[PDB]
Amino acid sequence: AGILFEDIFDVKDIDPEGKKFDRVSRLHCESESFKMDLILDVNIQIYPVDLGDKFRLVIASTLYEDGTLDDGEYNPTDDRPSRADQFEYVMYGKVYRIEGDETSTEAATRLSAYVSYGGLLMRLQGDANNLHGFEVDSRVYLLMKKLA
Amino acid sequence: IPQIGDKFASRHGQKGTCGIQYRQEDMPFTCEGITPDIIINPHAIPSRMTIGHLIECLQGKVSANKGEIGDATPFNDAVNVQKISNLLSDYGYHLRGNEVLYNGFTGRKITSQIFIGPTYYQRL
Amino acid sequence: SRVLRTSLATILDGGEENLEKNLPEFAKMVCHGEHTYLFAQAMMSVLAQEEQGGSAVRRIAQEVQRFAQEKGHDASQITLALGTAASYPRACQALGAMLSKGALNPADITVLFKMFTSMDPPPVELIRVPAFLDLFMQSLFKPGARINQDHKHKYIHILAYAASVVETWKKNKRVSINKDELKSTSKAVETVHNLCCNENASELVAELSTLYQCIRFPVVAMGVLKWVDWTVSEPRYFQLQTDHTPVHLALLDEISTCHQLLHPQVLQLLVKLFETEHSQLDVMEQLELKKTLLDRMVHLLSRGYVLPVVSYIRKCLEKLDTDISLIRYFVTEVLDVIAPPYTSDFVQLFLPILENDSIAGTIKTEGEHDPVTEFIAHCKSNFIMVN
Amino acid sequence: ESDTGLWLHNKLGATDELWAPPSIASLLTAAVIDNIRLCFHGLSSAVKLKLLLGTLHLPRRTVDEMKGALMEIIQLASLDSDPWVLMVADILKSFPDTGSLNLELEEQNPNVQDILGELREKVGECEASAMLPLECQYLNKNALTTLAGPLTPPVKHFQLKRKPKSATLRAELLQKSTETAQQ
Amino acid sequence: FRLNLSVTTPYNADFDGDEMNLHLPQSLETRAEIQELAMVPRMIVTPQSNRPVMGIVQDTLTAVRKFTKRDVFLERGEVMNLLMFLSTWDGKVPQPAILKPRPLWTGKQIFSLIIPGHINCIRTHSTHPDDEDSGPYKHISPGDTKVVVENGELIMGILCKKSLGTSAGSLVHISYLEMGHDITRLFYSNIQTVINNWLLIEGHTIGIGDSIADSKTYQDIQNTIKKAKQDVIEVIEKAHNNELEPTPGNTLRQTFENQVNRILNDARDKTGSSAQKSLSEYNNFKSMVVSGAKGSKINISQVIAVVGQQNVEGKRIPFGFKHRTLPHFIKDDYGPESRGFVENSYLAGLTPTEFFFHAMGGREGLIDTAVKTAETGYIQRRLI
Amino acid sequence: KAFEKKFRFDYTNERALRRTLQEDLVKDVLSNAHIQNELEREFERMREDREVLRVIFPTGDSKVVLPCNLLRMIWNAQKIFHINPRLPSDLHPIKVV
Numbered sequence A: 001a002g003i004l005f006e007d008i009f010d011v012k013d014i015d016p017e018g019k020k021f022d023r024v025s026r027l028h029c030e031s032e033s034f035k036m037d038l039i040l041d042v043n044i045q046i047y048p049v050d051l052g053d054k055f056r057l058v059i060a061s062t063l064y065e066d067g068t069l070d071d072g073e074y075n076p077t078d079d080r081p082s083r084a085d086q087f088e089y090v091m092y093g094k095v096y097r098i099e100g101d102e103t104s105t106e107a108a109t110r111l112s113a114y115v116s117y118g119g120l121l122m123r124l125q126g127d128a129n130n131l132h133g134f135e136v137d138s139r140v141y142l143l144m145k146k147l148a
Numbered sequence B: 001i002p003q004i005g006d007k008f009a010s011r012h013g014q015k016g017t018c019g020i021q022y023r024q025e026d027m028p029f030t031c032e033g034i035t036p037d038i039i040i041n042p043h044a045i046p047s048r049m050t051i052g053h054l055i056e057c058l059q060g061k062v063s064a065n066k067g068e069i070g071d072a073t074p075f076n077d078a079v080n081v082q083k084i085s086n087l088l089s090d091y092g093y094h095l096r097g098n099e100v101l102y103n104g105f106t107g108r109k110i111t112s113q114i115f116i117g118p119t120y121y122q123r124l
Numbered sequence C: 001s002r003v004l005r006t007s008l009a010t011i012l013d014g015g016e017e018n019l020e021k022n023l024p025e026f027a028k029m030v031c032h033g034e035h036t037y038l039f040a041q042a043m044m045s046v047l048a049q050e051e052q053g054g055s056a057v058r059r060i061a062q063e064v065q066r067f068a069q070e071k072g073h074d075a076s077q078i079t080l081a082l083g084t085a086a087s088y089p090r091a092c093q094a095l096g097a098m099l100s101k102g103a104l105n106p107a108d109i110t111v112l113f114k115m116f117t118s119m120d121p122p123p124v125e126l127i128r129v130p131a132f133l134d135l136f137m138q139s140l141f142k143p144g145a146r147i148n149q150d151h152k153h154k155y156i157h158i159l160a161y162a163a164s165v166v167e168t169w170k171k172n173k174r175v176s177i178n179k180d181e182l183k184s185t186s187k188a189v190e191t192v193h194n195l196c197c198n199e200n201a202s203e204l205v206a207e208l209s210t211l212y213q214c215i216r217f218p219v220v221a222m223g224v225l226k227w228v229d230w231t232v233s234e235p236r237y238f239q240l241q242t243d244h245t246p247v248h249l250a251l252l253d254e255i256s257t258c259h260q261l262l263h264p265q266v267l268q269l270l271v272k273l274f275e276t277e278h279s280q281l282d283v284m285e286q287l288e289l290k291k292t293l294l295d296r297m298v299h300l301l302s303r304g305y306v307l308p309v310v311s312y313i314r315k316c317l318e319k320l321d322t323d324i325s326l327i328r329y330f331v332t333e334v335l336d337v338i339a340p341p342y343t344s345d346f347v348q349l350f351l352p353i354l355e356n357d358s359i360a361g362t363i364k365t366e367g368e369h370d371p372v373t374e375f376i377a378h379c380k381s382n383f384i385m386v387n
Numbered sequence D: 001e002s003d004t005g006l007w008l009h010n011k012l013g014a015t016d017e018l019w020a021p022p023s024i025a026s027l028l029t030a031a032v033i034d035n036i037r038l039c040f041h042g043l044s045s046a047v048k049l050k051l052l053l054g055t056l057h058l059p060r061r062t063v064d065e066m067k068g069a070l071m072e073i074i075q076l077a078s079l080d081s082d083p084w085v086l087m088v089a090d091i092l093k094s095f096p097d098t099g100s101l102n103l104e105l106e107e108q109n110p111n112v113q114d115i116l117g118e119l120r121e122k123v124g125e126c127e128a129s130a131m132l133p134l135e136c137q138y139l140n141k142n143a144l145t146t147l148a149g150p151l152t153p154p155v156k157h158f159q160l161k162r163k164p165k166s167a168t169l170r171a172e173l174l175q176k177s178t179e180t181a182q183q
Numbered sequence E: 001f002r003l004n005l006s007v008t009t010p011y012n013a014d015f016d017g018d019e020m021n022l023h024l025p026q027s028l029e030t031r032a033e034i035q036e037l038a039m040v041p042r043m044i045v046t047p048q049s050n051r052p053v054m055g056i057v058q059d060t061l062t063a064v065r066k067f068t069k070r071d072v073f074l075e076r077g078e079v080m081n082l083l084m085f086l087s088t089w090d091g092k093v094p095q096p097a098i099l100k101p102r103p104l105w106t107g108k109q110i111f112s113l114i115i116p117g118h119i120n121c122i123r124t125h126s127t128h129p130d131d132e133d134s135g136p137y138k139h140i141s142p143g144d145t146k147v148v149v150e151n152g153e154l155i156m157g158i159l160c161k162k163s164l165g166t167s168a169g170s171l172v173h174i175s176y177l178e179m180g181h182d183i184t185r186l187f188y189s190n191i192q193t194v195i196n197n198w199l200l201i202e203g204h205t206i207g208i209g210d211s212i213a214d215s216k217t218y219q220d221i222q223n224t225i226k227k228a229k230q231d232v233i234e235v236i237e238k239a240h241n242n243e244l245e246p247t248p249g250n251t252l253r254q255t256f257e258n259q260v261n262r263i264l265n266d267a268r269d270k271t272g273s274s275a276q277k278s279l280s281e282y283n284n285f286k287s288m289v290v291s292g293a294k295g296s297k298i299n300i301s302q303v304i305a306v307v308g309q310q311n312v313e314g315k316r317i318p319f320g321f322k323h324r325t326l327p328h329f330i331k332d333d334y335g336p337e338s339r340g341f342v343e344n345s346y347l348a349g350l351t352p353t354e355f356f357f358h359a360m361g362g363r364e365g366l367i368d369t370a371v372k373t374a375e376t377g378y379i380q381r382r383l384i
Numbered sequence F: 001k002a003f004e005k006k007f008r009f010d011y012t013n014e015r016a017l018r019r020t021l022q023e024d025l026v027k028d029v030l031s032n033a034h035i036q037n038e039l040e041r042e043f044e045r046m047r048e049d050r051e052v053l054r055v056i057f058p059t060g061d062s063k064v065v066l067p068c069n070l071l072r073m074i075w076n077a078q079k080i081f082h083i084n085p086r087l088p089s090d091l092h093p094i095k096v097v
C-alpha cells in the first residue's frame, strides 16, 4: 500500500575505496534473491552496520499505511499509524535519476535508479520489472531493518 | 577607551580593526573560566603565513604556565615547536595549544578545538 | 570447433609476425564465453601434450590467457586446472589463491618455499607459468615496492629455481635434475635487486660492470628491462642529463646484446618512449632524446632484429608522421654501418622510406664512403626494374 | 531455499554476460548444491553452464567436502542433449575427483577427433622457427636447451661494416665505471 | 561604517584600517536614479567578464563547505535555530533525511531551503577527481564532489568557491539570471546569516597542530631534500670537469643553471606533493584551501615542508660580494644553500642566510607592489 | 558521421520513432513526405551552419559567449513541466522546426 519496492539485501562491502566521511559510509550490497546491487549511504553513528549483515529494505511512497500521500512537512505530532514502527532506520529523500541499459530501438532491461536522502546517495541497479515503481523527481522513503 | 574601528596589531604584521566588542558572558570560554580578550580570524594566517604568531601563542602558554618570560630569538635551535609542545603537555594542556572552547551563547561546546593562548598585542 | 581449427591453422602458419596481428582477432572469439575459453584451453593442453611443435601451441595458449587477464577473466584457475600442477594439490591451491589476487603474499611464498628445496620437488612446469613470473617482476623490481629483507632470499631462490633447473621426463618421471647454477642465478638476482633497492645513481654508474655481469642471465635481463621500463617511463624523469641520460639506455643496449628473445619487449619500450611527448623539455632537447632512442633502435637493428624496427620507421613516416629529421638520422646511422649482400625483405622494406620523402637530406658531407647512391645501385642490381 | 531453480535463474540468468560471474563461491553452498541436484533438469542451459563453470572456481576444501554431490550434478549434466553442457561435463567430470581437468576428450565426439587429427598434422609440419613460449624469456641458456632445443640464430639480412656508436657508449661507460669504482 | 562581507570583493576593502567615502544624494530625483542604477543588487554581475563580483567571502565559504558535506547532521533544536535566520522561509520545517532512530536533518536540506526559486546547476567541487566521470559512480559521487542543484534543491555535492564564488556559471550567477536581483540579495544575506549561525555550533580555527606533519612525512621531506642536494652537487662536479655538455641554444652556464633550477623545482614540487598527502582531512589549512576561501597548496607546502628557491629578478640570488653571495660562503659556490634555496619550512624556521635570502625575495615583491601602482593608474586614466 | 548520427533525425526507422514519439505523431511523420522534406532541409541548414562555424572558428574550440543559456533553459522547462523522459514525447517535430 504505497510501497514501490521491497527486497532483502546482504551487505558485501562497506566503503571499500577508503572512508571519505567518518559519520556516513556507503554500503555495496547484493540482493538475497533478485540479483540487484544497492549502494547506500548510511549514518554509522546512530545506526551501525557491519559487514556480512542482512537487512530488509522497503522503498515506500509514504509511511502512512493507508497511502494518504503527505506533502513532506515535518509533523512530529501526527499519531496516524505509519509503517516506520515496523522498521528502525527511515530515510526520506527524492529520486533524482533513472538511467538504464537502453537502446534507441528496443526497451531497457537493467535499470539504475538514483536517490538522494538529503545528501546521502543511494544507487539501486536492478531489473526493470522490479524498479518500475520509480519515477524521476518523486519523494520516497527508505525503511531498512537489519535481521539475523 | 578601545571601541570598534580601533586598529590593533600583533607583533607579526597581523593588524586589524576591532569588529565588535562582546561582554564576558557572550565570549566563549574554556573548561576553566578563561575567555579570550581578542578573537582573531583564522583566515588571517594561511596566505599571510605568519606561523611565528602561532608559535608565539604556543610559547606564550608555556611561558605563562611555567612562570618565566619565554625566549624567542630567531636563530636558536634550542627552541623548536616540538620542545615547546613537550613543555606545554606537562602543564595539563593539549600538545599543540588547542583547547575546547564552550560557546558563550548556547553553551554547547564547539565541535572544533579552538587554538587559544596569550600573544602580545599592540594598540596602534 | 572448426572456426577454432582454421584460426589455429592461420596463426600457426603465420608465425611471430602474425602473432601480433591475428591474436586479437583470434582472442575475441575464445574469450567471449568463458566456456569457449575452457574448450579452447583444453584443446591447447591436448595439443601441447606433444614435444614435436607443441611449444607454439603453448605460446598461443599463454597469449590467450594474457588476453583473458586483460579483458577481465579470472582465468588462472582454469589455467591451473588444465595443468599437471593440480596433481600436487596444496601448492596449486596456493597458486590459485595468489593468482586470483594478482599479488604476492610473503606467507604464501613461504608455503611454496617449504614445498620446494626438499627431496620431493613438484614438477617444474607449475612455476614456469609466465603471469606468475610477471607478478614476481612487479613485486620485486618496481623502483618503489620495498621487500622486507627476511623472506627476500626465499623470493630470489624461487625465481632461481623457476629459471634455472633442468629435468629429464623419461616416461612421466624425472631421474636427473640439477641445482648447480641457481646459486649463480640467486647471486645475480640478489645483486640486481640490491641495485634496484639502493636507488643511488652514482652507485648505479659505479657498479655498472657488475650489472653487465648480471645481464648475461635472461631472467636478470628481463627484470632489468622491466625496472628500466618502470624507471624511465616516470613522467618528468628526463631532468638528470649526462649525454641526454643514455645510462639506462646503455642497459637497453646490453639487454639487446646478450639475448634475442627480449627484442620485442625492447622495441616496445623504445617505441613507447618515442611516441611519448616529453613536456617541460627543450624542443632541441626533445629532438636529441629522439636521436638517442633512434641510436638504440639502430643498435637493435644491428643485432639481427631489423624488420619490425624498419616496419615501425615506415609506419611512422607514412601513418601519423613524426619528424622527418629523425627518420633521416635513422637512415644516416643505418647506412653508415651496413654492407652488401642484402636480403630481399630488407630491401623491399627499406626502399620506400629512402626513395620517397627526403631524398636530398641523406647526403651532405660523407665522401669517403658513398651515401644512399650505393644502396640505390644495389637495389637496381637486385630486383627486376624497381619491381 | 524454496523455488531454488528460479533463484539460480535469477542470480545467474543474465544471458548478456557469458563469463563465470564473481562471488560464485558465495553463491554455491553445499545446501544450495543439494537443492540444485533435484531441480537440475529444469533450469536453462546458459544458467546450467554458468553453474558448471562456477563449480571450478570453488576453493579446494569446499570441493573436497561434498564432491559426491558435484559428481552427481556432473552425471546429470552428461545426459543432457545440449552440446555445450555435454562437452563441459566431459571436461569437468575429473575436476572434483582428481583436481585436474580431463585431457582424454577423444571418445564419443567426432569433433575432437577432427580437430586433433588436423592439428596433429599441422603441428607436425610447422616445427620450423617455432614460436617459443612466454617462459622462454626467463629461463637460462642450458635450461632452454633442455626445454625446446638450441637457440635459433637470427637472419643475417646484411653485413656490418663497423660496430655502431653504442659500442663506444658501453666502452665509455665501462671506463667511467672503473674510474668511479676507484674513488 | 558597518557594511556587509560579500561587498568586500568588488570594493577590494579588507577592513584593516580601510576608510570609505559616503556621498549623500540630495535631490529626490538623483535618489531614485541611484536606486534604479547603482544599487548593489543591480551591480552583482559585472560587464567586464560576464560573471559576478560579489561571491561568498572567506569564513562563510569555509563554513558552507564544511556545512554541505555528506556527514553533517543537525538536531531538531539546531535546525530550528538555523531556520530562524532565513528571511525567505515559508514556515514549513522540511522532512528529515533521517526519521528513525532520531529526527536528524542533513545540512544540504537547510541549504536547499536557502537556494531560491527553482534553479538548476551542475558544478564540480575543487577536489573532484578527474577520473571519476570516466568510470562508474559519475552520478553517485563517492567523494560527494559533484554539485547538483536541481529544481531549487541541493541534490548533492560540496560547495567550494567554484560553486558559490565569483566564477562564471556558478550558483550565484544563475541565481542572478534565472531569478531576479532582489532574490539574489536575499540569497547572499541568507547564506551569510545561517552559515555563520551554524558556524557558532561547528566552530572553525587554525592552529599549530594544523602545521605539523607526522614524522614519516618529515623523514620523506628530509630524504627528498638530501637526494636533490646531492644531485645538485653531482651536477656541479660534472660542470667543473667539463663533462656537462651544453644544451643547443644557450651557453654552458645557462645549461648548468637550467639543470640546477630544474632539480630544485622538482624538489620543491615533490616535497610539496608529499607534504599535502598528509593532512588527515581535519587540517584547517586544507579546510581553507579546498574551499578556496584563503590560500593555496603552495602555502601548505611552504608551511609544512619547504619554503623553496628564493629568486631575485627571476634568477637565483646574485653574487653581490666578489664571487660569493654572503661572506659565510666560499667563493664560487653554486650550490643550493649558497645561492638562495631554502630547505627549511616556516614551521622549523630559517637559518640566517636563508632568512636574508628570503628577505631579498620579499623585498622584490614589495618593490613590485609599490612601483606598479602609479603606472597602472596612469594607464587607466589614459584609457578613460 | 557523429554529426549525422546526432543531428539528422532519421525518420525511416519505425521503432526509434515509436520510442521517441506518440503513435499519432509517428504515423504523421511516416505518412507525409512534405514533413520529411522539411526535416531534410533543416539538416541541410545544419550542414551549412557547420561549414560556416568551421570558417569562423579554425581553432577547434566552442566555448563562446551568447545571451540565452539554452541548455539550462531546456532543463528548466523539463523541471517545470515534469517531463518523465522515459515516456514517448508529444511535440511534433514540425512544430519544433
Ligand SMILES: [Mg+2]
Pocket: E013, E014, E015, E016, E017, E018
Ligand atoms: Mg586595507
